[model samples]
Target chain A: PLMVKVLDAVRGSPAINVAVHVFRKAADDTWEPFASGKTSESGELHGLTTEEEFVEGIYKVEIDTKSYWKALGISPFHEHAEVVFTANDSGPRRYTIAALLSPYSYSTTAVVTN
Target chain B: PLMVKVLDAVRGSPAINVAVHVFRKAADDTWEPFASGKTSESGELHGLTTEEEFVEGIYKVEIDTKSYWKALGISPFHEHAEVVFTANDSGPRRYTIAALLSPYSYSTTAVVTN
Candidate 1:
């Protein structure tokens, strides 16, 4: 499964209604869409890919940063924010993708938890 | 001048006392240390490179994530959080590097204001 969270850079506020997308990379290096949604008031997208099974390969999650920034009346530095990671059976049973984002910058990490 | 702000990912709290370093990339691709300090209670480092003049080319700012996460009693996915950007006379006179960070992830953006 995948979980994502977004926050403000300076004020530490939740970025509500931010759009998020999850993608699984195909063998041909194409990004196949897996899931898409918007963040809640808590700045989170829980169980983003619960319906999908975990496979061994590369995966990506992209945030609709331009719209989020525009809604907040701020200029964005990047059009979108992306997080990429590799999955494998050797990794933990559960994988969490957490991200911190602002209008100008963003960061993400993939972690395995039991 | 340079200003940096660090915030939490989920709870949107200030990441106080986090160590921050600013480096200027030389023509030879060597990173020359410019400033090193810790974030204040406001989760900010003000006038980081005030004494130094803003030159052209690339620069990097690194956050000591390991120490910060350790202090917060969380496991870190990355050893450090880094932000790389370009600088030139055509850019705004004042630059701000805003970072949103958590133990698992981080994001940074460089913006110019008056």
Candidate 2:
């Protein structure tokens, strides 16, 4: 199981309608497109990949931060915010990911459970 | 001129006593240590550098993330969380930086105000 959350720090609420894309590292050292979706009113997008498909590998999750801010009539610093890391290396686990957004910056974090 | 905050996602509270170190890129492409401090009970650290000293250049802020999680008897994935970005290039401004931490990951963001 997997989740992506985006929160607006300035507004102290969940950032809605931000799109998230997930990619996996291919054997040739390139990113293979895996999944994509937008966040909900709850600032979350769930089930990007199944436990079976989310095997041990390196995954990159990038959130379209600029578009989200652009829609709100604000200029943001980054075009997007991305987190790259190794996942499910040891065994199949659940992952909860979140990104906190501000006009000038964004923070990305994750929680892992066995 | 600057502020740093660390939030604990699991506990949903300010994470106190996490050491944060600030550095600026020197002319020779090395990081020059500037200031360091621990967060307060409110999970905030203020005035790492003055507006005068925080000139047009790249700055790096690193939080000693491992020590904080270690104290809580948890093993986090990353040793430390660092945010590197250009600062005051357009002009001297105030910065509000925040890091959201989970056992397996961390997200760092900043707010720049004129």
Candidate 3:
């Protein structure tokens, strides 16, 4: 089964030296980080792909919620969050996962066409 | 000086009954609430305009960040933030201020032309 690929985007600011974690469905039915990587400035994590290694089912993704903002001397309320969604069709599907984040609040979504 | 107007937009969600506070510059140079109102479900507070009551200078706008997310049982990291900018122009100027808020972070900007 193909895996769902996730990416990040930041506006007006660059994403530098940020840690990202990819959570996959484990045999115990829990989502866990299958891989991790650092993002470059311009707030983009394009070079780091999450396709080569992913299993089907449902999974959650977690950003290094705390350290990311701490670098800027800002204490963010949310350390990390898990986005739960179904991965029924994973045949080389391209999904756009963007997060609009600030020191105080953020939003995420999967741009998948039905 | 005329005050800047702010607005909110929620993707895949609606804005409802949100308490927005507009802070104005006082004679002592302190920012205080000149007006407040509840936003509709579309996340729009159009009916509650802020232009009628405003004075020039650098005034900060604070949104009841906590209670807004609490309505949905979401704990947001940022309770409120103050945006500092110059309001030297005292004429019929239309400025657009918008915020992108979430449980963890948010972004704001003032759209003005030179």
Candidate 4:
């Protein structure tokens, strides 16, 4: 139901070992932890959250960018990167949350598949 | 000094006519408007701000995603998309802020050139 891909813009490869954390908004407007994992050699989280847990509501995803860059002997801009939006509001659909990263910048985009 | 490029993931082309707004963080931690414009036929804002005005500091960019998708007869997920990070901190350089957009998702990345 949910997937994530991180591309390393500087190296033109997948951002390996970047941790991805997910949270869902609770009824009281608090963020409830959903899932957490690191990107594989392919720069993707094969399946972070299952379809059953990926319900309709607001969700937020964060990638640990600082560690990824610092490990490479460089400092990053943002402490991390985030994308927040409502999901499954229109009904069930597959989601691919993607991002391209650099030491000084990062871009995030989303793709949906059947 | 600063550039922006937006692509339409659905159409597999540049995202034209998308409005881009830029802001710089003031000393008091408030956002001061810096520049505003729309992407051209090339799917880019030729130059949002000059080198002089693009000094070292934190910057935030927003693209009106809803309006773009709404114009195309599709509802988008995020009302808008944003990237906030410190720019020119390491040194002055040409920066290209890039993004890929879909009705249900958007990804952002940054590139620096000579």
Candidate 5:
């Protein structure tokens, strides 16, 4: 089970909504989704647990960026956001993934290890 | 006029739908949208010329991530994706912006400077 966080950078707007999905690496190195959820009022989503959850290997994650905007009556410039990440060493740790988004552009950081 | 491109990286999924909004920088360094649109079947959205429009300064771009997934009958955890970008030197140039998405996670890059 891995915890993921999403941020809504839209300023001076009503509450933004978002959905999150979790994927695990298959035996053949392919990504297979195990679970999904939506963000809260504070623009955050968590508790991603799947039958084939995130192992100590390469995993992938994706979020829907279009629906969130439409809910606010604002259209987006891009459709979806897909992030591929590798989480090694399974343990009770925390991974922080962040993205700075506006109406046309965004920036994100990968999971950092110490 | 600026040409922007969006790419979908979701594997083995139906065509994704996306809506985009264009924003222009105001005197107060704020963003004011001038236009909006959605991505084609090939997962690409272009021609963002809002009434405010993108100028030679710091601009912002956002996308609705949640609706796109729901349209495919796929529920997303995050609601939206907002990207803040700075497009300097006003001119007619092509901007390439790409995001890797799945059901739960995503990654995006800023405009490259040459």
Candidate 6:
């Protein structure tokens, strides 16, 4: 399963009410929407792919940076941000896609946990 | 100009002395090495492309996650992390690529100033 969390860059504040999307790569190299959700007040969307069994392949998660920043009345450099990774059977079953974002900048890291 | 800074995810601590790489995409869509450097004690590598003028194109910055976490005696979930962006004359000239990372998870955000 995969989870995503969004937060502020400097103060580590949760990015409440932000929308995020998850996509899986098809064999032809096209991306198909896998899941989508909005962050809670805590700035997280748990179990983005709860119904789907974990499969080994390339996956991507995208955040709606423009809307999120605009809602906060701030302009951002990048219109959106994405994180891509390879999921394999040998890797940890549970994964977390953490996004640390600011009006001007953001960062994303993927971590695995049992 | 492009600047990169590495940091810890939870407490917002500086990554301190981690290695990072910069690459520019070639016309053929191959990544060509543009610059390489290490973060300072403050977790920053300013002006990674100091000698080169900022060109409008796709660029990428990569962090050595495995080596960095290993040096700190911690195991990381991802082997490496990368940030890709497009630079255009219409956008802000000065940019900051901030990486917020943890052993299990990470996030990156890019902001423009000046």
- Every model's DockQ: 0.04, 0.04, 0.04, 0.06, 0.03, 0.05
RMSD of each: 11.7, 11.2, 10.1, 11.5, 15.4, 13.6
TM-score of chain B of each: 0.90, 0.94, 0.71, 0.94, 0.73, 0.92
Per residue, candidate 5 scores C-alpha lDDT tens digits across A1-114 of 355555555542212367777677789877777677876664566666632554566666677777777776788887867777766554334454545556576555543322
Winner by DockQ between candidate 4 and candidate 1: 4
Q: Give the best candidate by DockQ.
A: 4
Order of the predicted models by DockQ, top scorer first:
4, 6, 3, 2, 1, 5
lDDT sort, best first = 4, 2, 6, 1, 5, 3
Candidate 4 regions exceeding 4 Å error are: A89-92, B1-7, B10-114
Winner of 5 and 6 under TM-score: 6
TM-score, A chain, model 1: 0.87
The TM-score of candidate 4's chain A against the true chain A comes to 0.95
Could you give candidate 2's per-residue lDDT for residues B1-114 as a string of tens digits?
A: 789988888765578899999999999999999899999877899868877777878889999999999999998989899999887566436677878888998766665545
Indicate whether candidate 3 or candidate 4 has the larger TM-score.
4
Across residues A15-91, which tens digit of lDDT does each residue of candidate 6 receive? Answer: 87888988899999999998899998778898677625558888888998779888877778888889898987775
Instruction: Summarize candidate 3's per-residue lDDT along B1-114 as a digit string, tens digits.
Output: 222222223333334566677666778977766656766544455533344444466666666667877877777787774566655455335443445566676666554422
Q: What does the interface RMSD come to for each candidate?
A: 9.8, 7.7, 7.7, 6.3, 11.3, 8.7
Fnat, model 1, is 0.00
Each model's lDDT comes to 0.75, 0.83, 0.54, 0.83, 0.59, 0.79
Residues B1-114, model 1: lDDT tens digits: 678877776544567898999898987889999788999877789867652576676888898878888877788899888988887676556776877776676667555644
True contacts kept of 2: 0.00
Error of 5 at A24 (Å): 1.7
Q: CA shift at A104, candidate 1, in angstroms?
A: 14
lDDT of 3 by residue, A1-114 (tens): 212222222333444566777667778977766656766544445543444544356666566656877877778778864566665563334444445456666666554422
Model 3 regions more than 4 Å off:
A1-11, A47-52, A90-92, B1-114
